[PDB]
Ligand binder design. Structure first.
Ligand SMILES: Cc1nc(=O)c2cc(CN(C)c3ccc(C(=O)N[C@@H](CCC(=O)O)C(=O)O)s3)ccc2[nH]1
Ligand SMILES: Cc1nc(=O)c2cc(CN(C)c3ccc(C(=O)N[C@@H](CCC(=O)O)C(=O)O)s3)ccc2[nH]1
Ligand SMILES: O=c1ccn([C@H]2C[C@H](O)[C@@H](COP(=O)(O)O)O2)c(=O)[nH]1
Ligand SMILES: O=c1ccn([C@H]2C[C@H](O)[C@@H](COP(=O)(O)O)O2)c(=O)[nH]1
Lengths: 281, 281
């Protein structure tokens, strides 16, 4: 019945039927290919309870995406340092970007969502009016023709791939509308069930809530589709303890004011109610 | 359990729990959002048996994709009329392509696989060395680094969308490797369960077999993920008759010769074995 049981079953499935694989760095993982879960967004927000999810991070990262920013320093100054390692001088130099400034992640998510097709110079350049604004295109389509089957937002850009500090995990997401409800399916090519995935679920569940607010629709379902679903070997024991835990009722997300555009959203507009996560592992 | 039961249950689920939504054609559909199925490619080929599928069509269409052709007449000259209507004078005029010559479908599938990012002129143009050859990249990645989690081939191009006579249904596909087996996951944003889906399943299964042959691996699984899965109202009755029939064993696909490249593949290299379907409806 509870939505979190689906995630727990997926983690259990990988431990149960996964194959021993390897990484880019070489650490070792248990992996399964092709998984799908469906989380209900009706009167509840999917922020996992068996293990704490960095809420401030998902909120600040998404507002940073919408802003169209590719500067990691703009997210770091907000207290969210999850992209700092990829924007460092050392990492950018190992990829061959020496003339590039520090913090410049290349044409990642934000740039693809707002300026698809545009030529990328640097993080400080003005890209207004350049490229295809997929985000606004999504919102407008939901407002004009909700039955459309092409309401898609793609971050996977083969042409811009060599320039990105890190290739997109969330390659593509599609929206759907029935009975005044807004659903969303995410295609995640690679997902770490131990840390990344629970953060990813929350992020896109928030995106769906945001767009539903602007279009006057109600949040429906969130279909999470995975490509390479893995669990790192050094996390087998902690996750074993997490599987034994009983899920607490999912919290509730509340938007405190009526906003017209997606750009007008602020941290103060969001309120999480009833989030009681289990201790640390 | 037979692999075709997954497809049949999916059709049953859409008639039972689906929603009466609308279409761009305005013909009316029964729709569901977010489905997934897994078809084993180990010593068998997922060519549906409860209804005869046009094998010549899926074979000729795929070699047409690989060739990079966007000329519908180039496919028609082989007895495969599947894209004739999309390339006809009346259809091209209605979309606003009055200057385009017959058969010019625009930057469709084949162009996106071989020349992503290239500026399209027309079907009789030379695009050699232009764009990103995604197909070649996938093959080279599987050979030199099989554990990679970015083995993706994307046909969804927001920039080229308004130029396409036929919008991409199979928007993205990913490849995966374990135990010397190649698996593929396809993200179909829109799929007509009555006609298109059975054809699409065979198409990418064949592609997996093709790439697996060149890379020296064995065909693994074909994961089919759907977005807007639908059934047209006029297809309800003939599908009710298909649900009644019992699945016969899947045929086997045999590659008659050792081919080095994806471009060296020809029709004479393939032969379907043991295909005994039910009378076409
Ligand atoms: C091996 C590996 N697995 C991952 O899932 C992963 C994910 C990201 C990006 N991502 C989408 C993240 C989600 C959550 C995060 C995290 O760092 N949570 C911490 C906060 C760290 C800080 O405050 O600096 C936490 O849970 O406390 S990071 C970057 C490297 C990775 N590396
Ligand atoms: C409403 C609609 N649904 C679809 O799925 C669809 C698919 C295509 C492209 N496609 C993926 C197709 C696969 C097979 C096909 C077909 O017409 N088969 C015929 C033979 C005609 C020929 O000789 O080419 C048959 O089964 O009799 S059409 C074109 C228009 C569509 N229109
Ligand atoms: O939002 C994100 C970002 C990263 N990762 C994890 C998944 C992989 O373990 C790793 C990225 O490695 P590649 O898939 O790019 O090889 O980071 C996620 O799960 N979610
Ligand atoms: O490979 C294909 C090509 C087309 N279609 C069908 C299903 C859709 O109903 C239709 C395309 O219409 P849109 O989804 O683009 O609106 O063609 C498929 O199912 N598979």
């Amino acid at each position: 019945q509870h939505g979190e049981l689906q995630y727990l079953r997926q983690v259990e499935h990988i431990m149960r039927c996964g194959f021993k694989k390897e990484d880019r760095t070489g650490t070792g993982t248990l992996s399964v290919f092709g998984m799908q879960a469906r989380y209900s967004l009706r009167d509840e927000f999917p922020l996992l309870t068996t293990k704490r999810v960095f809420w401030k991070g998902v909120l600040e990262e998404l507002l940073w995406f919408i802003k169209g920013s590719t500067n990691a320093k703009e997210l770091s100054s907000k207290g969210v340092r999850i992209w700092d390692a990829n924007g460092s001088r050392d990492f950018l130099d190992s990829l061959g970007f020496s003339a590039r400034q520090e913090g410049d992640l290349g044409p990642v998510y934000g740039f693809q969502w707002r300026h698809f097709g545009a030529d990328y110079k640097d993080m400080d350049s003005d890209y207004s009016g350049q490229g295809v604004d997929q985000l606004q295109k999504v919102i407008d389509t939901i407002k004009t023709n909700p039955d459309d089957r092409r309401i898609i937002m793609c971050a996977w850009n083969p042409k811009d791939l060599p320039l990105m500090a890190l290739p997109p995990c969330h390659a593509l997401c599609q929206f759907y509308v029935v009975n005044g409800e807004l659903s969303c399916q995410l295609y995640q090519r690679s997902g770490d069930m131990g840390l990344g995935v629970p953060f990813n679920i929350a992020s896109y569940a928030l995106l769906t809530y945001m767009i539903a607010h602007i279009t006057g629709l109600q949040p429906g379902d969130f279909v999470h589709t995975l490509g390479d679903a893995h669990i790192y070997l050094n996390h087998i024991e902690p996750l074993k303890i997490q599987l034994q835990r009983e899920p607490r009722p999912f919290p509730k997300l509340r938007i405190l004011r009526k906003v017209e555009t997606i750009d007008d959203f602020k941290v103060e507009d969001f309120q999480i109610e009833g989030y009681n996560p289990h201790p640390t592992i």
